[PDB]
Design a protein around this ligand. Structure first.
Ligand code: NA
Length: 129
């Protein structure tokens, strides 16, 4: 499923992400924009055998199990296929676990490079939240 920007903003707010661990809602929408272009089916297969899954491109080396990544952990304790759903709930719950560590949203390189330090509120501007 390909969310609209404002549709995803509303859904992330309803899933409790506004100011979660200090990151305002627009951070999360911006991260989804540059990780997956709001596509819950997005995948990115890396040549180390790991894969990034879903709207927030959550990687199978650390966070989810896909059974195809050697030496991997499953720290969100979920199958990676749960990250491909039209319901963003599993991606959001794993995202909350990832962002609660020392590096915060720096775990998302796209967020680090295209969002951090910018006026991220622009990503929720005009959305009737
Ligand atoms: Na894994």
């Amino acid at each position: 499923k390909v969310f609209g920007r404002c549709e995803l903003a509303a859904a992330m707010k309803r899933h409790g992400l506004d100011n979660y661990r200090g990151y305002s809602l627009g951070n999360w929408v911006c991260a989804a924009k540059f990780e997956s272009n709001f596509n819950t089916q997005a995948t990115n297969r890396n040549t180390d055998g790991s894969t990034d899954y879903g709207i927030l491109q959550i990687n199978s080396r650390w966070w989810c199990n896909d059974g195809r990544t050697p030496g991997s952990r499953n720290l969100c304790n979920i199958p990676c296929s749960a990250l491909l759903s039209s319901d963003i709930t599993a991606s959001v719950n794993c995202a909350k676990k990832i962002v609660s560590d020392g590096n915060g949203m720096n775990a998302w390189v796209a967020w680090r490079n295209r969002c951090k330090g910018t006026d991220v509120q622009a990503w929720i501007r005009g959305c009737r939240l």
